[PDB]
């Protein structure tokens, strides 16, 4: 592989569900590349079974010189219109950071995400409680990444 | 919605599991757009599977005329290596044909797909003997509001 990730740091973790994801990625490039890299962030739900995955954002990174390179990929939060059952945001979900070169994926970094709603505030401590997405919090387990590598051509 | 789908015709149906998907798509664009459309096709397994969706292919379409447009989206087949429980390519899966403008998905066309196969040693599912059939007359459409320009 001509590109190798050296570090991925999630700048804003924990965070509110609706906050953008900010990943600070450092990589090395060992040979000349004619094109930009294409990074992607995909939101993946629970074994919930009635959820389709959702591309949050893609980012073209370049030009890319040989050396150690760095950038921040700020991705949109999940679109809840794509999440019919609102209650499926809760519990453990997955987040996939991948990169492609000329439409061919070569790397994929998967993380587990913990999701949880605030309990009642003191004033509130009757009505059934909605899942208020503005009161849901994520925490990505940025120290336990699952990495998968794909052979592509780099010519 | 500034873009609307008029027809989706599956060109090579039924077909072998490992044959490319070919969708002839006709859509109407009503206003000028600054950017391309971004099509994707997404393999979706069973409820019983723990595998997240598999993006099979994507394609920029553009620039977009005001009017009625047609193109063909030819998408690579599923990668067998990302299906660790190979048996769940069998029976009824899903394909989602979707389109995004500026990284926002505005339309999703969902299909059911039927899949069937043509001392003793355990056998593995032979993929070259699996046929798919997309149920192309019964698409489930979903529009989402996006910002466009």
């Amino acid at each position: 592989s001509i590109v190798n990730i050296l570090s991925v740091n999630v700048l804003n973790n924990p965070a509110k569900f609706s906050d953008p994801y900010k990943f600070e990625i450092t990589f090395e490039c060992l040979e000349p590349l004619k094109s930009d890299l294409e990074w992607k962030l995909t939101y993946v739900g629970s074994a919930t079974s009635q959820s389709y995955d959702q591309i949050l954002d893609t980012l073209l990174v370049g030009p890319i010189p040989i050396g150690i390179n760095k950038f921040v990929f700020e991705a949109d939060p999940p679109n809840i219109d794509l999440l019919p059952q609102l209650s499926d945001v809760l519990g453990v979900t997955v987040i996939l950071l991948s990169c492609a070169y000329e439409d061919n994926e070569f790397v994929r970094v998967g993380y587990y995400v913990n999701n949880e709603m605030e309990g009642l505030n003191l004033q509130e401590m009757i009505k059934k409680v909605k899942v208020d997405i503005s009161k849901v919090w994520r925490s990505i387990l940025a120290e336990k990444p699952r990495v998968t590598r794909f052979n592509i051509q780099w010519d | 919605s500034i873009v609307n789908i008029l027809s989706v015709n599956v060109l090579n149906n039924p077909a072998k599991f490992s044959d490319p998907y070919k969708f002839e798509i006709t859509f109407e664009c009503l206003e000028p757009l600054k950017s391309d459309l971004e099509w994707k096709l997404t393999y979706v397994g069973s409820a019983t599977s723990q595998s997240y969706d598999q993006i099979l292919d994507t394609l920029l379409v553009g620039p977009i005329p005001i009017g009625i447009n047609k193109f063909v989206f030819e998408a690579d087949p599923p990668n067998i290596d990302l299906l660790p429980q190979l048996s769940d390519v069998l029976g009824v899966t899903v394909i989602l044909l979707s389109c995004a403008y500026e990284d926002n998905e505005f339309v999703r066309v969902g299909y059911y797909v039927n899949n069937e196969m043509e001392e003793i040693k355990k056998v593995k599912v032979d993929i070259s003997k699996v046929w798919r059939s997309i149920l192309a007359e019964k698409p489930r459409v979903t529009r989402f509001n996006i910002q466009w320009d």
Partner: peptide, 21 residues
Amino acid sequence: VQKVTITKEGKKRVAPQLLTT
């Protein structure tokens, strides 16, 4: 602080900081 731009096709694009070569 990053130079962000947008291709004709509508893709956002950033220029990465070359740290060292």
